[PDB]
Each structure stands twice: as structure tokens, then as C-alpha cells.
Structure 1
């Protein structure tokens, strides 16, 4: 079943079980680009719910009937709470201001509010999509507001909590591995030792700094454009509206949202999203290093490095013992690469503003939310299904410590540099160890080697 609505181009059938109206149906026909995977991110829709709630509450002061305003606030809450996601079928690839989604939100909130008040759907009575739900608003300043509400909420609920879990798990392994001495690798060549915990402490620092970098990129995300209306002047709205809407959004979300000090910078550009994307771009570089390292450190069982034993996430064959594919490392490094491409997409859009309005908004916030969700989700997955279950192959690590040529410099003050190079060059030529060689040349006894060559003493300055 369907109802009949009209726009300036013709009549449109609107499904009776849908709260959107003719303007949304027209948008689904004029913007058939990409399919359902391209739908406007739900976080933006929910952020509009919060936003329309705050606006309706403020415009009450300016005459808006409380019976209507309260119905708008109730319907807005349902959008914010994810109760009406099925009534937003529009894709990212619409107008660059996000007008169609703003209209989508206005139509859904009015028809739902109309229903709450016993009215007829599609009639704009008593709740009018533009005169009431969009009162004192514009697509140009509401969509940017929704972008920053959505990004802030995603950062604080998904991105940062995910990185925190990865940080804590990496820190636990650093402490767990504090006593395991292994051979370092510089240029991928054997190098002087360090503890597996020291190496992991570097990953911990990178994730710690990743969270600091994301937080340092949030202050200007908290600035809201609501109040600039069409070009940033605030024409057709009341003094104090901008500040009151921001304070209301801050109270509803619990986050320190504020009104943008300059609404022209807030409409004509989205450099804060470029900034936030850049912090996630750095995070991706950090997580690419961490994941690839763990990937190669777990390589083996015999023709790789074999320092780490990663948990199984795929069925391991009985005839292939010890073989574990680093599946989560692969998901994480693919996510990292994706974030890097998304950042360039954000950068191109952020650079192409025209005069009073940047009209790349939907694609910029899509890429920002995409990266934040992937990094957060991937961090959790990488933590629970890999990091927490990493074990050290101490037997193989200690074996390659005894077989390494790197510890020969510990003999320098006892038998001389030249005699040390002879042990090194000889063991290298013969393929044996340093101790077996040093003994068979008569340079020292086995008990002298054990006393002179101590890797535990090669882990810091003196």
C-alpha cells in the first residue's frame, strides 16, 4: 500500500509504512548512485535527531507551539535513538550540502510527530517539515552541525575506546615479555639485543600517542555551525539562537559542544574534518607498523622468524602443526590502507570549497566516519582475537640467541677486538655458534664465555 504525495515535478507514490515524504522519494530517483552500501551513515541520521531535538526546544522560546514542539522532540528522540533507521534511504552521493538528508529528516520527524498527534501522514498538518521542524535552520548549517556531532560521538564511543583496549593489551604483553631477550633487527639485519617487552613498549607508545593525536584534533570538531543559516550571517534567526542550540546539544550528548566563533569558516570549509582525518591517518601508519611487525614476528613455523605464536582464528590442519595465518594482522593492515585512501578523499573535498559553502560535506563525513568505525572496530578485533593470546616462542628465541653472531662484541674487553672478529668470521664460515668456535680456537674456556657474554647486560647504557 502507498499514499500519494506531490512535488513540483509530478506525483509520487510513498509507501504507507514509511515516514519520509515526496522530497525523499524524488531524491531516491534523482540520485541512483552506488546502491545501499552508499546510504548516508546512520551516525549522521542520529546526529540530526539530536540536532532537531535541540532546535525544536530552543524555537519554543520564539513562539513555536509546545504541543507541536514536544511532538517534534519526541520524534527527534526516536531518530537519535536509532528507532527509525529504515526511513532514510538516501545515499552519500547527493547534493554537496546534504540538503536531501536534511529534508529526509524533516519529513520523517514531521510525519512521525503528526502520527503522535493523531494526524494524517503526508499532510504537513499540524507539523510542517520546513516551517516547524526546520524552523530557523538551513541545510547549510545543520548538516555541518550533524557532521561534527556524529564525528565527536563516534570518536568517543568507538574509536578511542577501541584504541584504549589495544593499548592496554599491548601494555600487558610488554610487561609479560619484559624478561625475554631477543635479537633486534635494523634494516632487517641482525642487530644488538632488546627485550620483547621493550619492542612491545614501542607499540604501546604509538597507540598512546595515537589517542593523544585524535584528542588534539577534537577541539574544533566541538564547534557547531548551527546558527549561520544560509551563508553564515545568521539571517532569519534570533540573537542567542546559535549559543542556545549548542548548549542544548552539549547537554543532550554530554560532550563540550560550542558554537563556532566564525560561522563563515564553519560553512565554507570543513578543515576540522581534514584535521581529524589526518590524526586517523597517523593512527593508521602506527597500526600498520604494529600489525605488520607482529605478522612477521609470527612468521614460520620454520622458514620465518618464529618469535611469536599467534592465536588460531582459522581451522588449523592436523598435518600442518604450528602453521597459523595472522588473520587479524591482515584485517588491520587492510583497514590502515583504507584509512589512508579515505584521508586523501577527505583532503580533496576539504580543499574544494567555493565562497560561502563547501559542497562536499556528505563524502567528507562519510570517509571520516568510515575510518573511525574501521579503526575502532579493527582495534577491538585485533586485541581480542590476536594480541591478548600472543605467546613468545622462548625456545626458538633463546636458540637463535645462542646461534647469533651479534653478541661477539661482549668479548672485546677480555680477548681483544681482533680475536673477537676471528671467532665471528670463523663461526660464520663454519656455520657453528660463537661459543663452540671460541673454544675450538683456544681463545677461552666454556666457563669464561658464560661469564663474559651476558645478554642481560647489553640492554641499556652504562
Structure 2
């Protein structure tokens, strides 16, 4: 069931059905921290597949045999496509440079490429893990490169598409609710009116600004450390490799990847991950506000606010109609709280670089990818399972509109401030409506009230 390999610490049995080698096995034994929920995120593994596929191509310009290079390229493609996920057992909580995952990727790609060429698994023949798969002689620049490839792909494929669906759904609701006038709330107190569409337009602007903030953090993420090698000097790599491998990654992904103008800044720190995490942290604040507002606007049905009727996803009780738990709102606000904590973890790691190398890399990219996946997935779920199905309780909204004390300022240019203040003061102490009190005081007639108190005329400046 196993083959037998050796490192400088002793004998190791590697399962025959695994493409990793003795380096990966030893790493798994030395870092038993967290369990399988702590394995290196799949986007990082796939990004390594893209990077090795790109380097193998470029390395043909530097002596790499085309028959070996093509075998590496096909094996790297299988990694980048998620076909070999079960051959990467390492946890995030490894070395701070992530080079143990780099050696995991080198072992898997060479062994798979060896098998494609009919060789013996574990022999390093004819595809060597270091001499061929890592022909670039890259070391501490590999994992930084895979971090930015994975972050850029996850932002383009998961985060922004999810937020775009949320933006469009909120915008459709805003237009659908454009003519429903409701009582505003400031300090949670009754305030002058606005429409549900105006309130939802604020949500739309927040999501629009969130997508702009995330895009503004991407230019630095597109800068790749590949070519810096050990300390950023580029020692042991070939001239032109840094630019060529970045341009190849750009062509493989369709994203505007470039080489980092300063490789020492690219290895010694990961401020671009901190800035991207900061944009997602701002997005979390926007989504917390939006989801909590809709949570409260749908509260009820009779002892809450009751403005919105949210779609029911979980089965209720036949004895409890009208009760709809805002469960998509709860999942979204929990995600937002998680992103804020993830950002602090990213911040602590990003601040603790030492000299030529920041060695908090796996934890930083884990929290960045975690935040991006959660925000993208929750935005999709929030959209499809709640936002698109939100209905307005227009009957309740219009009833509370006529019973509110907030429309009384519409009578000031008819009966003066103090007569209007006395109608509101009396109606408050009496539990009566504004119209009922304005007539019982003999200040105006009903036909005058309906002519002067028009809420559609209180939605903008004059």
C-alpha cells in the first residue's frame, strides 16, 4: 500500500496512491495544528498550479527540456483545475514563508509528470521536484506569488460577482419601492418621511461603493513577487524571468498581472493583502448595516416594525403564521462580524514582518481568502433567498403614515408654527391622529387638511 522514502530524519512510508513525497510527509508530522478544516485553502493550491505551469513554459527559454516542460505543464494544469486536491495535506500553520506548501506542490507536480512519462513514482526521474519543477530557483517568492494570484482570482470570480448580484437586486427593489412613502427613523425615533426606494437607494450606493473600494485595492495585488528569489535581489534566477513569468500568468488568467517594481517590498511585507482586507472590512460594515436594517424592517408581524415581508426559507409552524425568521440576514451579519475579525488577524500578521521576509504569509492569505469567499457566497445567498423576494407591507405602512405625528410640519405655512405645535402636542397626549386633533381644536377642516398635508410633497428640497 506504501512506497518507502527517506529524509535526513529517517524512513517514511508514502501511500502509493499519493503524489506527494517524503518532504510533505515529514511536514505533516511536524505541524499537527488544527485538523482538516485548517488545510491550506484550495485557491492557493490552484494558484501554485498556474504559477508552475507558467514557469515551466518560460523556463524553456533557459534550458528546460521541452519534453519535461510539457509534462510539468500538464501536471500543473491538473493542480490548477482542482483535480489533485487530495494530495495536499498541509495545514496553514506551517512555516511562515509557506515554502512547505511550495515543496508539496513541487513533489506532486513532478511525481504526476513522472507518471505521465511512465516513470517510477518517488524517483525524481526524469522530472525532478527542484531541478525541473522549481527550475526558476525561486524560494521565498513562490508563496507570495501564489497568494496574489489566488486573491485576484477569488476577487474576480467570487467576491465582485456576488456583490454585483446584490447591487442589482437592491436596485430593482429600490425602483419597485419608489412610490411607497414611509415614516423615517433617526435615533430610532419617528422622523420626517421618505420612500422605501430612497432608503433602498442608500443600500445600493453602499454596495456600489464597496465594489469600487475592492477594485481600488487590486492594482497592488496584481504585482507578483516572482523573480525575487531568497531576499528580493533575484540572485540565482535568470534576467527577464520575472517579467516573462508575470506576463505568462497574465495570459493564463486573463488578469493584468505584472512583476513587482520593488521585490524587497514584495517579500518583506504584504501590505496589499492588508489593504484588500481593509476594503472587505469596509464592505462588511456596509453589509452589516444593510442586513440589520432589513432584519429590523421585517420584524413583527405585530409587535415589531412590520414594514417588509421577507421570504420564508425554513419551514415554520402551522400554528405560527406571519412569523418569518430573517435567517439570511443572520447569516450575512455573522459573516460581516467574521470579516472584521479576519481583518485584525491580517493586520497583526502584516505588521510583524522581519527584515527581508514577512513570515506570516499562510495565515494572512487564509484570512483574506476566507473573507472574500464568505462575502461573495453570502451576497449570493442573501440576494437569491431574501432580497429578490422582499415585499412591502403597504397596508401597515400607509396606516402608520396617517397616524404619525411627523407630517405636522406641512401645516406651518397655513396656520403657523405654534398652531401646528399645539395640534401635535395635543394629539400626542390624546392618542389621536393629527387630522382628528386639528379639527377637534377647530384649527382647520378635513378638506383643508387633505389639501395641505400631502406627503408626496415632503420628499425633497424646495
Give the TM-score category using the shorter length: over 0.9
Q: State the distance in 2 between where 1:6 and 1:457 align.
A: 83
Q: CA deviation at 1:247?
A: 0.3
Task: Give yes or no for contact 2:174–2:197 (8 Å, CA) kept in 1.
Answer: yes
Q: Secondary structure at the match of 2:131?
A: helix
Q: Secondary structure at the match of 1:132?
A: coil
Q: CA deviation at 1:426?
A: 1.1
Q: CA deviation at 1:138?
A: 2.7
**RMSD, aligned α-carbons:** 0.6
Count of residues in correspondence between the two structures:
462
State the TM-score, normalizing by the size of structure 2: 0.99
Q: Secondary structure at the match of 1:140?
A: coil
Q: State the distance in 1 between where 2:404 and 2:330 align.
A: 30
Task: Give yes or no for contact 1:137–1:226 (8 Å, CA) kept in 2.
Answer: no
What is the CA deviation profile of residues 329-366 of structure 1, one whole-angstrom value per residue up to 9, with x for unaligned ones? 00000000000000000000000000100000000000
Q: CA deviation at 1:422?
A: 1.4
Q: State the distance in 2 between where 1:398 and 1:8 align.
A: 79
Q: State the distance in 2 between where 1:322 and 1:371 align.
A: 34
Q: State the distance in 1 between where 2:268 and 2:396 align.
A: 59
Deviates more, 1:8-17 or 1:439-448: 439-448
Q: Secondary structure at the match of 1:49?
A: helix
Q: State the distance in 2 between where 1:277 and 1:7 align.
A: 39
Task: Give yes or no for contact 1:98–1:139 (8 Å, CA) kept in 2.
Answer: no
Q: CA deviation at 1:135?
A: 1.2
Q: CA deviation at 1:59?
A: 0.9
Q: Secondary structure at the match of 1:129?
A: coil
Q: Secondary structure at the match of 2:322?
A: coil
Deviates more, 1:72-81 or 1:431-440: 431-440
Partner residue of 1:312? 312
Task: Give yes or no for contact 1:38–1:92 (8 Å, CA) kept in 2.
Answer: yes
Task: Give yes or no for contact 1:97–1:139 (8 Å, CA) kept in 2.
Answer: no
Q: CA deviation at 1:440?
A: 1.3
Deviates more, 1:157-166 or 1:133-142: 133-142
What is the CA deviation profile of residues 17-43 of structure 1, one whole-angstrom value per residue up to 9, with x for unaligned ones? 000000000011000000000000000
Task: Give yes or no for contact 1:138–1:229 (8 Å, CA) kept in 2.
Answer: yes
Q: State the distance in 2 between where 1:314 and 1:435 align.
A: 43
Q: CA deviation at 1:419?
A: 1.2
Task: Give yes or no for contact 2:270–2:358 (8 Å, CA) kept in 1.
Answer: yes
Q: CA deviation at 1:137?
A: 3.2
Q: CA deviation at 1:460?
A: 0.2
Q: State the distance in 2 between where 1:352 and 1:338 align.
A: 22
Task: Give yes or no for contact 2:138–2:237 (8 Å, CA) kept in 1.
Answer: no
What is the CA deviation profile of residues 22-76 of structure 1, one whole-angstrom value per residue up to 9, with x for unaligned ones? 0000011000000000000000000000000010111111111111111000100
Q: State the distance in 2 between where 1:382 and 1:331 align.
A: 8
Q: State the distance in 1 between where 2:454 and 2:95 align.
A: 68
Q: State the distance in 2 between where 1:156 and 1:67 align.
A: 34
Q: State the distance in 2 between where 1:385 and 1:205 align.
A: 21
What is the CA deviation profile of residues 170-216 of structure 1, one whole-angstrom value per residue up to 9, with x for unaligned ones? 00000000000001111111110000000000000000000000000
Q: Secondary structure at the match of 1:59?
A: helix
Q: State the distance in 1 between where 2:243 and 2:103 align.
A: 24
Q: State the distance in 2 between where 1:453 and 1:65 align.
A: 84
Q: CA deviation at 1:139?
A: 3.3
What is the CA deviation profile of residues 274-319 of structure 1, one whole-angstrom value per residue up to 9, with x for unaligned ones? 0000000000000000000000000000111100000001112222
Q: Secondary structure at the match of 2:192?
A: strand
Q: State the distance in 1 between where 2:99 and 2:437 align.
A: 78
Q: CA deviation at 1:436?
A: 1.0
Deviates more, 1:170-179 or 1:56-65: 56-65
Deviates more, 1:378-387 or 1:318-327: 318-327
Task: Give yes or no for contact 2:285–2:336 (8 Å, CA) kept in 1.
Answer: yes
Q: Secondary structure at the match of 2:191?
A: strand
Q: State the distance in 1 between where 2:51 and 2:421 align.
A: 73
Q: State the distance in 2 between where 1:184 and 1:139 align.
A: 59
Q: State the distance in 2 between where 1:276 and 1:168 align.
A: 23
Partner residue of 1:379? 379
Q: Secondary structure at the match of 1:165?
A: helix
Q: State the distance in 2 between where 1:329 and 1:90 align.
A: 35
Partner residue of 2:287? 287
Q: State the distance in 1 between where 2:354 and 2:19 align.
A: 34
Q: State the distance in 1 between where 2:98 and 2:225 align.
A: 14
Task: Give yes or no for contact 2:179–2:195 (8 Å, CA) kept in 1.
Answer: yes
Q: Secondary structure at the match of 1:5?
A: strand
Task: Give yes or no for contact 1:311–1:389 (8 Å, CA) kept in 2.
Answer: yes
What is the CA deviation profile of residues 416-439 of structure 1, one whole-angstrom value per residue up to 9, with x for unaligned ones? 211111111111111011111111
Q: CA deviation at 1:413?
A: 1.2
Q: Secondary structure at the match of 1:220?
A: helix
Structure 2 gap segments, 5+ residues each: none
Q: State the distance in 1 between where 2:360 and 2:56 align.
A: 27
